[PDB]
Enzyme design. Structure first.
Site, PDB file in Angstrom:
ATOM      1  N   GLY A 144      -4.710  -3.499   0.262  1.00  0.00           N
ATOM      2  CA  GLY A 144      -3.852  -3.188   1.228  1.00  0.00           C
ATOM      3  C   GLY A 144      -4.249  -4.040   2.420  1.00  0.00           C
ATOM      4  N   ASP A 176       2.239   1.665   9.839  1.00  0.00           N
ATOM      5  CA  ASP A 176       2.585   0.892   8.559  1.00  0.00           C
ATOM      6  C   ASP A 176       3.215   1.864   7.427  1.00  0.00           C
ATOM      7  OD1 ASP A 176       2.687  -1.448   6.995  1.00  0.00           O
ATOM      8  OD2 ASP A 176       0.634  -1.292   6.374  1.00  0.00           O
ATOM      9  N   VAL A 200     -10.527  -3.826  -0.828  1.00  0.00           N
ATOM     10  CA  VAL A 200     -10.003  -3.669  -1.874  1.00  0.00           C
ATOM     11  C   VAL A 200     -10.086  -2.294  -2.391  1.00  0.00           C
ATOM     12  CG1 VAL A 200      -9.867  -4.973  -4.366  1.00  0.00           C
ATOM     13  CG2 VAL A 200     -11.257  -5.909  -2.556  1.00  0.00           C
ATOM     14  N   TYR A 213      -6.863  -4.249   4.427  1.00  0.00           N
ATOM     15  CA  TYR A 213      -7.889  -4.892   4.453  1.00  0.00           C
ATOM     16  C   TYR A 213      -8.950  -4.367   3.245  1.00  0.00           C
ATOM     17  CZ  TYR A 213     -10.499  -1.039   6.496  1.00  0.00           C
ATOM     18  OH  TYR A 213     -11.161   0.272   6.554  1.00  0.00           O
ATOM     19  N   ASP A 235      -3.364   4.267   3.430  1.00  0.00           N
ATOM     20  CA  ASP A 235      -3.716   2.918   4.256  1.00  0.00           C
ATOM     21  C   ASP A 235      -3.490   3.114   5.947  1.00  0.00           C
ATOM     22  OD1 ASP A 235      -4.455   0.400   4.896  1.00  0.00           O
ATOM     23  OD2 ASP A 235      -3.120  -0.611   3.710  1.00  0.00           O
TER      24      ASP A 235
HETATM   25  N1  LIG Z   1       0.296   1.013  -7.985  1.00  0.00           N
HETATM   26  S1  LIG Z   1       0.097   2.693  -8.505  1.00  0.00           S
HETATM   27  O1  LIG Z   1       1.698   3.244  -8.347  1.00  0.00           O
HETATM   28  O2  LIG Z   1      -0.279   2.611 -10.024  1.00  0.00           O
HETATM   29  C1  LIG Z   1      -1.128   3.544  -7.712  1.00  0.00           C
HETATM   30  C2  LIG Z   1      -1.389   3.327  -6.329  1.00  0.00           C
HETATM   31  C3  LIG Z   1      -2.352   4.073  -5.830  1.00  0.00           C
HETATM   32  C4  LIG Z   1      -3.035   4.955  -6.396  1.00  0.00           C
HETATM   33  N2  LIG Z   1      -4.121   5.831  -5.873  1.00  0.00           N
HETATM   34  C5  LIG Z   1      -4.690   5.749  -4.583  1.00  0.00           C
HETATM   35  N3  LIG Z   1      -4.612   4.281  -3.939  1.00  0.00           N
HETATM   36  C6  LIG Z   1      -5.293   4.359  -2.573  1.00  0.00           C
HETATM   37  O3  LIG Z   1      -4.990   3.164  -2.175  1.00  0.00           O
HETATM   38  C7  LIG Z   1      -4.232   1.854  -2.887  1.00  0.00           C
HETATM   39  C8  LIG Z   1      -3.738   0.919  -1.870  1.00  0.00           C
HETATM   40  C9  LIG Z   1      -3.430  -0.339  -2.832  1.00  0.00           C
HETATM   41  C10 LIG Z   1      -2.567  -1.220  -1.794  1.00  0.00           C
HETATM   42  C11 LIG Z   1      -1.761  -0.838  -0.975  1.00  0.00           C
HETATM   43  C12 LIG Z   1      -2.389   0.403   0.029  1.00  0.00           C
HETATM   44  C13 LIG Z   1      -2.948   1.564  -0.673  1.00  0.00           C
HETATM   45  C14 LIG Z   1      -5.827   5.335  -2.103  1.00  0.00           C
HETATM   46  N4  LIG Z   1      -6.267   5.550  -0.946  1.00  0.00           N
HETATM   47  C15 LIG Z   1      -6.768   6.662  -0.871  1.00  0.00           C
HETATM   48  N5  LIG Z   1      -6.667   7.573  -2.054  1.00  0.00           N
HETATM   49  C16 LIG Z   1      -6.017   6.502  -2.736  1.00  0.00           C
HETATM   50  N6  LIG Z   1      -5.230   6.760  -3.986  1.00  0.00           N
HETATM   51  C17 LIG Z   1      -2.907   5.046  -7.879  1.00  0.00           C
HETATM   52  C18 LIG Z   1      -1.981   4.505  -8.251  1.00  0.00           C
END
Ligand SMILES: NS(=O)(=O)c1ccc(Nc2nc(OCC3CCCCC3)c3nc[nH]c3n2)cc1
Lengths: 298, 255
Positions: free
Chosen positions: A14, A128, A18, A16, A146
């Protein structure tokens, strides 16, 4: 420190760091690990991490992603979050040919407004909101994620960072260079997302600031001193701007009915002062028969 | 202002949790209030050199006082605590914070030291850096002026900032209370007006509850040209703050 976590896979990047999906070996809990590389000899701990961590430790709410722990080495920072199942964008793409049921759209908006009213009540701006930063689970929950661009604000606001919000979701007062923006910038993004849940394409897909403004004007009409006192004095307002008539909202998101259109129009009000707050929106008639169904896919 | 009251209520809760330990300096073997005064004054200077927000200064001071509430520090390391704290406050609060290099330059220590201390300060504060300040309460109180007065505002900030310098007595007062005193004192100095009724409704504070802080603040204000530390007075001579430190304090408050 990280001994009790087993990495499963990468989720994404996102604002910042990974994010990885991992599992607690001792409890079974599936987590999201945000990995932040530090170093010394450079800038230290990033302001985004400082803000995100300190604000997320205060913002415990069912519709806000939960920060579980901070594991802090001299070399690496790891934020441990509750893992959520999917993001809204992937879910909208998956709903390609069924559509998203209206009860589910209505549940999600209601929940998003809850998480957002809690943020604003705790003097936090998200800055955002976009479907990629909005996470859905199997029990029908949706959560704001995020908080890398978030910040704590004062009453009244002062000038904050201008380069803020992903363009498609960016409020006209940011686009027109206003020195004070506030809570209304998050409501705008949510209005854009409401529309997007319904049509399943972005309401204003611009590729530049002027393009974005013009897409907004063609839909809602070009703002004048009547609809938005002060607009013509704004720094990036131009008298040369084409003057487009306002579209009937029944044409903006055709499947939406009367109550839905009313709510959307108050979220997309030009004048940030007139734009509805997240708090006031919870009691909109759109929500009178709101329920919380599990998502209809997976 | 859909949230002004929610936010005030929430800040009122947080300021109690974010409060430094009132008697921490008796527990410090090697540093004194007077050494702290010197450090705070220097931070005022850094704030001015880099055109930092007054809020950043107020936060940095909160970080130092909470750090020193639990961590023993030798006099030769006190400026390293203050530097890391100001670096942390800037990253949190500023649109354009100074780089680490600029903080190294403005101090004595290395970049490595400053960065390690940064990580140390974060650990000790457990990353809890969104703290209420006198400044955050003042800007909300300013909304209750009829009509708004720039001299009142700048003078209230000036008084609230002087309170940062002197641990004894000001560690014992909450930010909302110092802000109350500062606001009434400024209003009175400038216009002859008093702590308004609408702020009693908002805060629950009256002139009676503010009185002990006010008596302290009034004395600090009268003796200000004579204080060993002078950076706030110089800073507030500037037209940016309407030259308010040139204004004469009242001889009595009559409370
Ligand atoms: N693409 S996806 O649909 O396969 C899918 C997406 C996100 C997640 N899960 C999840 N992701 C996070 O940040 C992920 C991050 C990625 C880049 C954009 C900002 C968010 C989290 N932060 C706390 N809990 C979190 N849980 C599971 C599957």
């Amino acid at each position: 420190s990280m001994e009790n976590f087993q990495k499963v896979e990468k989720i994404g990047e996102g604002t910042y760091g990974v994010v990885y999906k991992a599992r607690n070996k001792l409890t079974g809990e599936v987590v999201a690990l945000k990995k932040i590389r530090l170093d010394t000899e450079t800038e230290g701990v990033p302001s985004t991490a400082i803000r995100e961590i300190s604000l997320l430790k205060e913002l415990n709410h069912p519709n806000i992603v939960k920060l579980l722990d901070v594991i802090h080495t001299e070399n690496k920072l790891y934020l441990v979050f509750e893992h959520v199942d999917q993001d809204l964008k992937k879910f909208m793409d998956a709903s390609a040919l069924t559509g998203i049921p209206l009860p589910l759209i209505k549940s999600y908006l209601f929940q998003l407004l809850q998480g957002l009213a809690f943020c604003h009540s705790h003097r936090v701006l998200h800055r955002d909101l976009k479907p990629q930063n909005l996470l859905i689970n199997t029990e029908g929950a949706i959560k704001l994620a995020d908080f890398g661009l978030a910040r704590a604000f004062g009453v009244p606001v002062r000038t904050y960072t201008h380069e803020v919000v992903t363009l498609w979701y960016r409020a006209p007062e940011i686009l027109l260079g206003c020195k004070y923006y506030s809570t209304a910038v998050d409501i705008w993004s949510l209005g854009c997302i409401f529309a997007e849940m319904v049509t399943r394409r972005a309401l204003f897909p611009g590729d530049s600031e002027i393009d974005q403004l013009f897409r907004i004007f063609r839909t809602l009409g070009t703002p004048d001193e009547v609809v938005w006192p002060g607009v013509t004095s704004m720094p990036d307002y131009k008298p040369s701007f084409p003057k487009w008539a306002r579209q009937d909202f029944s044409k903006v998101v055709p499947p939406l009915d009367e109550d839905g259109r009313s709510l959307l129009s108050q979220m997309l009000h030009y004048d940030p002062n007139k734009r509805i707050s997240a708090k006031a929106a919870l009691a909109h008639p759109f929500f009178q028969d709101v329920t919380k169904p599990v998502p209809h896919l997976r | 202002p859909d949230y002004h009251e929610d936010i005030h209520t929430y800040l009122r809760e947080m300021e109690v949790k974010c409060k430094p330990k009132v008697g921490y300096m008796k527990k410090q073997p090697d540093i004194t209030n007077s050494m702290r005064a010197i450090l705070v004054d220097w931070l005022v200077e850094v704030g001015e050199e880099y055109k930092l927000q007054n809020e950043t200064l107020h936060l940095a001071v909160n970080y130092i006082d909470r750090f020193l509430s639990s961590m023993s520090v030798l006099r030769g390391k006190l400026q390293l605590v203050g530097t890391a704290a100001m670096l942390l406050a800037s990253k949190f609060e500023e649109i354009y914070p100074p780089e680490v290099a600029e903080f190294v330059y403005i101090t004595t220590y290395t970049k490595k030291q400053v960065l390690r201390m940064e990580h140390l300060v974060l650990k000790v504060l457990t990353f809890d850096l969104a703290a209420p300040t006198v400044n955050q309460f003042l800007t909300q109180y300013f909304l209750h002026q009829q009509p708004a007065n720039c001299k009142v505002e700048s003078l209230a900030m000036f008084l609230g900032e002087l309170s940062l310098i002197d641990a004894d007595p000001y560690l014992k007062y909450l930010p909302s209370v110092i802000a109350g005193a500062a606001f009434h004192l400024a209003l009175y100095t400038v216009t002859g007006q008093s702590w308004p009724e609408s702020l009693i409704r908002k805060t629950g504070y009256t002139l009676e509850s503010l009185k002990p802080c006010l008596m302290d603040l009034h004395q600090t204000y009268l003796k200000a040209p004579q204080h060993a530390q002078q950076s706030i007075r110089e800073k507030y001579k500037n037209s940016k703050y309407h030259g308010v430190s040139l204004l004469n304090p009242p001889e009595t408050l009559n409370l």
